[PDB]
């Protein structure tokens, strides 16, 4: 079968694929199902925003993506506890709750507490009975719009650094190096044996 | 132009609903316009038709000022039979030729309780 110069092609068509093929001609219909599903979700609720649970702020776990940031799933129980509010109180406020999430980094941890202080500043709620506890006055006709768009706070807003200008100094262009990667990379590979070779040097005696 | 999404602009579906209509739907397709002096009194454009309506034919080979009486209304063939509309067979016996009542002008009606009540509902809604 093969011939003059061409690439080896191995397609996966020995398996009788024509019985099992999903065809996307139902693609405009579901798209109109789903706008009319979100808009049916829009006019049920009330003043509360669609996509209304607020999400936390989470850095992306790898070496590849950890220089960007992402709306996670739920505020940490210990994050949310620094704001001081109880668990199932908080979901009625409209905050997402996640028990699985730790907090190793207080720069991460306090950044979400600032976000909850933001949202609880942001919040205009309504009571059942106007006994005036954590409630709102006649407030900007339900604050000028009932519903928000794509999260309440624009969760990405990925923060950039300027560090605008500086003079270059002595002893940085004198000392820094390529080689202080290579010296340190080779330092890490030999920490085990350099510990042991000197340990059996003094164990010899 | 059709702006309902739930109505037929199909040729085959409309002919199917035509020739397989129920009888009480079949009353309204065989509707006939009234004479324009009589429509001034009633304020109605056309009427469903019945057994004793005096009728002026307008189209056919039998045209113009022949106001007789109707006798049968075959719903099954979408065809009425009028008194005056004749034609002989071969064997000396007369028979009645039928005309579809899109081609018929009603000059006299039959007046009864339920014929008035339609006519009020027709005349009010034209408004």
């Amino acid at each position: 079968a093969p011939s003059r110069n061409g690439m080896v092609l191995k397609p996966h068509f020995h398996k009788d694929w024509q019985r099992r093929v999903a065809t996307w001609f139902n693609q405009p219909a579901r798209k109109i199902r789903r706008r009319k599903a979100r808009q049916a979700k829009a006019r049920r609720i009330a003043p509360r925003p669609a996509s209304g649970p607020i999400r936390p702020i989470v850095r992306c776990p790898t070496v590849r993506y950890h220089t960007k940031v992402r709306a996670g799933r739920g505020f940490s129980l210990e994050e949310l506890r620094v704001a001081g509010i109880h668990k199932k109180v908080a979901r009625t406020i409209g905050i997402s709750v996640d028990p699985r999430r730790r907090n190793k980094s207080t720069e991460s941890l306090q950044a979400n507490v600032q976000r909850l202080k933001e949202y609880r500043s942001k919040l205009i709620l309504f009571p059942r009975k106007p006994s005036a506890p954590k409630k709102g006055d006649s407030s900007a006709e339900e604050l000028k719009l009932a519903t928000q768009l794509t999260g309440p706070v624009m969760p990405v807003r990925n923060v950039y650094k300027k560090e605008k200008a500086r003079v270059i100094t002595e002893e940085e262009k004198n000392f820094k190096a390529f080689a202080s990667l290579r010296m340190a990379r080779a330092n890490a590979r030999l920490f085990g044996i350099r510990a042991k070779r000197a340990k059996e040097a003094a164990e010899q005696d | 132009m059709k702006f309902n999404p739930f109505v037929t602009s199909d040729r085959s579906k409309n002919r199917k609903r035509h020739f397989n209509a129920p009888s009480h739907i079949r009353r309204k397709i065989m509707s006939s316009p009234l004479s324009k002096e009589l429509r001034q009194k009633y304020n109605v454009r056309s009427m469903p038709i019945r057994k004793d309506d005096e009728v002026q034919v307008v189209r056919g080979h039998y045209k113009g000022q022949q106001i007789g009486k109707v006798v049968q209304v075959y719903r099954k063939k979408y065809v009425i039979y009028i008194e005056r509309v004749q034609r002989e067979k071969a064997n000396g016996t007369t028979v009645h030729v039928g005309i579809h009542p899109s081609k018929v002008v009603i000059t006299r009606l039959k007046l009864d309780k339920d014929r008035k009540k339609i006519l009020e509902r027709k005349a009010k809604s034209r408004q």
């Binding site: 093929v21 065809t23 001609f25 | 132009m1 602009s9 199909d10 040729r11």
Partner: protein, 260 residues
């Protein structure tokens, strides 16, 4: 087809009988028994490569080329030679592109349409469409396509405020929003230069929405108007200019046919 091109079941006789080697259905009595079964060349056989629903129907086109096509098709609709060459009646019309007021887009009744188009001298085009509403040629009359009707003008507008109700059932007209343009409406069939009525806010939104070469398009992403192949394109005025016809050789017009 998908299935039941051949619901039937058959095997072939083969050698010792004089017929052929098409499969023949199994049984007797019913006089299809013994006939030719599936394949191309038989009664009640399947077709050749029974057509499949997963053919490549839809075609994807680059977003700059689509916008290139709208930019070109709008450009044809500003020359009277091209737009009469499509077939429209502009012989007594008002000057090309023709901006009617933004007061138009709040009309209610449709006598207000007819009184408009007879005063703008566009009514001659509609009266062609009345003369051209003949019946289909072919078999399309069975499959719901029965009226052939040639197009007329199209009113390009923004801020729909009643014009779509008043201009709706004019015969052969396409009532078309500015910021949602089609190539299938502006140049139907692929022959450019449809006669088009622009509105005031329509014809003033085009400066914003496509931009000059000098500024950007302040209503889209990163679309300047696409740069040109020639700038000054009068072929005759170039070739009669003093620069060229100083520089040329000479003309040469003798014929010098076959010498016997």
């Amino acid at each position: 087809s998908e299935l039941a091109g051949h619901q039937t079941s058959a095997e072939s006789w083969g050698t010792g009988r004089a017929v052929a080697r098409i499969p023949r259905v199994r049984g007797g009595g019913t006089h299809r028994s013994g006939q030719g079964a599936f394949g191309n060349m038989c009664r009640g056989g399947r077709m050749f490569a029974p057509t499949k629903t997963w053919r490549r129907w839809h075609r994807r086109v680059n977003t700059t080329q689509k916008r290139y096509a709208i930019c070109s098709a709008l450009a044809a609709s500003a020359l009277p030679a091209l737009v009469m060459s499509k077939g429209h009646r502009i012989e007594e019309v008002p000057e090309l592109p023709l901006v009617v007021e933004d007061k138009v887009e709040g009309y209610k009744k449709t006598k207000e349409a007819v009184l408009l188009l007879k005063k703008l001298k566009a009514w001659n085009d509609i009266k062609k469409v009345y003369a051209s509403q003949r019946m289909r040629a072919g078999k399309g009359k069975m499959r719901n396509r029965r009226r052939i009707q040639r197009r007329g003008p199209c009113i390009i507008y923004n801020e729909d405020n009643g014009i779509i109700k008043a201009f709706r059932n004019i015969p052969g007209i396409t009532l078309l929003n500015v910021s949602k343009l089609n190539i299938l409406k502006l140049a139907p069939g692929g022959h450019v230069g449809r006669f088009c009525i622009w509105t005031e806010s329509a014809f003033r939104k085009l400066d914003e929405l496509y931009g000059t070469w000098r500024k950007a398009a302040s209503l889209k992403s990163n679309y300047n108007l696409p740069m040109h192949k020639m700038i000054n394109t009068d072929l005759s005025r170039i070739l009669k200019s003093p620069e060229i016809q100083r520089a040329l050789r000479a003309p040469r017009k003798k014929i010098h046919r076959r010498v016997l």
